[PDB]
């Protein structure tokens, strides 16, 4: 593909789509880059991002309530380079499940009641991230990360 970019896992997508990300290439720096997998989550990279020759397939993995960028930091470029910069993460589907029912807790009430946001927000804090929000309807947990 145009500016050496690999993304083939079914389920993953990018904004702009891999397509446009061709007619953008000549190298391939595209601001407001987005990468995500339906049903699981997404990752927003605001402003200028250099995709030049990244192999997304190997670099970014978005799994239920757990996103990971750069498998073995042996590659994790200088903080700022490639996707190792900062970004917004959204993990959809995140919901807790009770010990008894093992049925997932979606009721915005119960959630509110057991302050799930609390945990999620806390978690992001310990991880050194910036908790932005928790949307119950979709179980979307979003937070900022300075780097991966």
């Amino acid at each position: 593909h145009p500016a050496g970019i690999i993304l083939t896992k079914v389920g993953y997508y990018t904004i702009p789509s891999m397509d446009d990300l061709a007619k953008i290439t000549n190298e391939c720096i595209v601001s407001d880059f987005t990468i995500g997998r339906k049903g699981y989550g997404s990752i927003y990279f605001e402003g200028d991002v250099n995709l030049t020759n990244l192999n997304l397939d190997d670099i970014v993995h978005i799994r239920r309530k757990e996103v990971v960028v750069y498998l073995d930091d042996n590659q994790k470029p200088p903080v700022g380079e490639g996707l190792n910069r900062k970004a917004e993460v959204t993990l959809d589907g995140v919901w807790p499940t009770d010990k008894t029912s093992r049925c997932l807790i979606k009721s915005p009430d119960r959630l509110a009641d057991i302050n799930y946001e609390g945990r999620l927000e806390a978690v992001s804090r310990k991880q050194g991230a910036q908790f932005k929000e928790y949307r119950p309807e979709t179980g979307s947990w979003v937070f900022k990360v300075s780097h991966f």
Binding site: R63, K65, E66, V67, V68, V69, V89, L91, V94, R119, L120, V123, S124, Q127, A129, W141, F143, V145, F148
Partner: peptide
């Protein structure tokens, strides 16, 4: 790596 492990 970031997420909820448990």
């Amino acid at each position: 790596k970031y997420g909820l492990q448990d």
